[model samples]
Target: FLWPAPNEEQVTCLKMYFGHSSFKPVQWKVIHSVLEERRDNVAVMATGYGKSLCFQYPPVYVGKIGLVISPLISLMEDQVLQLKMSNIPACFLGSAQSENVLTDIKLGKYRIVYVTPEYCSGNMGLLQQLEADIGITLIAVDEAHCISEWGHDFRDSFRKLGSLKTALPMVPIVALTATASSSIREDIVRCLNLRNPQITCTGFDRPNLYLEVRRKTGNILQDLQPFLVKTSSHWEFEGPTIIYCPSRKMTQQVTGELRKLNLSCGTYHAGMSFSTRKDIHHRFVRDEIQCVIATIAFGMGINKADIRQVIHYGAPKDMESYYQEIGRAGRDGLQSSCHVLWAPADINLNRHLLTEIRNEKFRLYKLKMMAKMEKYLHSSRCRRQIILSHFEDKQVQKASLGIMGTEKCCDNCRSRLDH
Candidate 1:
């Protein structure tokens, strides 16, 4: 059994290793839960929302015996890099190739541990022993949205978290996510069997972000090229771009053409090897690449903040996916451009994409969401107003936002806005 390094040992470790003597807005509340309430919680906050700080500091303030369940390897990798940058003693256990890394984790040398559900599935015996030995005080489920079938990224192992919680009823859990729908929220609770969890929702809609969609024309090879060129404008604040297509093949094709136009771009998809994915991600970070032509597989907790634009070469499967993808832009809190042009033939292509998914129910749901996206795209109302209302929030009428005025976004209805 692994044991705590010592009590009050965490604060010293935080001071010596992390170089921080403070806590952010939600950190103390998280610490209070562990120190006082001794309860689990759900943090439904937005991206860049500091959800990691909850478990990150608890080990230092209370006890250092905590287990964090991550969603993907790339995410775990990115987070580990950040902790290492701060000189924090954190470790990750995953990808059988990381067995030596597990040796460090088993010895409790690292103050915090990050691991994906894949690791949990493969090493149940090790997990049983780790929990049995350590007396786990905290368990954090990152990107908790994946636990729900209704969510955009559903993994089978995420469904098994209920049993893990049942096994360690005494442990306090903290589930964190950027986006989750009402239906996804219900399933997340059921799947994790969250026991009277303290649900905290801090919502922020990205107002500066302008959402637009283009219907795909009959031929994507030609139709998408013109749309792809918009991301490369040489304006002062012009930053990197992220183009999310529905398939790897299309990403490759569009990126090939974008590169032909002398626009910098890199292609990313699950079909590539791990190293290839890492290369594409790092190139973008290093400024070696300014554009990512990708499938949804590329959203592995990327932290690029200066993204000036996010383009969709193909239509999204649903409004939920649309909102999340578009949110990736202007993360630096700057003004950004978003545009989607579509031909009527694009609807048939969108339908074809949905039918290809192995799960029929999921496919049908995707179709319904696409139809809704179409309604949203063609609506004469404020695009932001229409999109925000999907979350059941009322859109504030803003004169600067096109539907109310003759803003650039509402160019289709320019003459009427003046009256």
Candidate 2:
């Protein structure tokens, strides 16, 4: 056997730390590959599929430190907070760290240390010191798709993470993400230089979510009024909603329009001050604000579980982004809806935005990605099927068969059966 099966000790650890009686089969497999075999792994699971546990449990069970390289500050902070609430010793390295925090980290007071890829890459000396002091047993790269140029959220710092294997060759790395296409998956393995890694995908089908794409008319606010009214009126029963705009300008515009219609809403974007953004995020989480019009900046690692609606005011730049954004809803496994309102103008706008990238090849590649989104928007097929096929999901045929007859599957399937 490549790795031994999970034993009772592991299940006891799960129950003690995470308060779970058992691990999901996929979760156990990932933990076994990382903790038992000491091999690199890539886990492509859905958003709420307990990807965190795969990394968190190993460190807690083995009594060693795991270094998690995350993308956003908010995400890292949220993770650290959640870990602390679970009574796990975890902390994140950020710009505002005090000297005592560093000393404690060096003293091995924390089992998990979260850092942004930029911070991790820039502070290689600190990483080496940590290795020398207490030793890092595992390196988990969250949002691993960002390392791939073919992925939607490519970051230079994530690309720099390729050097981690050279810096700490003995430590196994586990890369995790919610969405990645076939090309992106291949790129992640090659870029990270994973050594014959165990790749596990739990599939990307969120059957509880109903997908619909609408043609954007000139009066977009008017077109969205009825749906907005219904959701707002039943906000208590249906849960809060999110309206995703392509730009900060659109977030402000949409928030203003919704307010003009007497709807209580907030706007979120990178341009907002940190405190302001935090306030809005908290309010939305508390259900004090039933809706928030936001850019992609809003929901990377948001922990709220009852988001009932995700409305895309304009088409996302790529399928990865679209899927990731929509995945924010229905995370509670209840019936939710995703609506994408797009016009031909969105394509032109996205193309113009791509020109900001100086590299012609990279720009063209992004444009091609956008073209895929265009096809998804125009295609008259099961949205779930198209997405699953893009990701090379092995169970596409069986999953599509089950999804095709469901009333809450997708717009095309519903229309096909006249449901």
Best by TM-score: 2
User: lDDT tens digits, residues 256-357, model 2?
Assistant: 777766676888887888788888888888888888888864234345688898888888867656766777787667888888988888754457767776
Quote each prediction's TM-score: 0.71, 0.80
lDDT of 1 by residue, 308-364 (tens): 777777666567666667767776767776766555555434476566666555566
lDDT of 2 at 37: 83
Candidate lDDT (C-alpha), each: 0.65, 0.77
Cα RMSD to native, each candidate? 7.1, 4.2
Segments of candidate 2 deviating more than 4 angstroms: 1-8, 19-29, 42-50, 94-109, 117-135, 143-163, 176-194, 197-202, 230-238, 297-303, 348-365, 396-404
Best by lDDT: 2
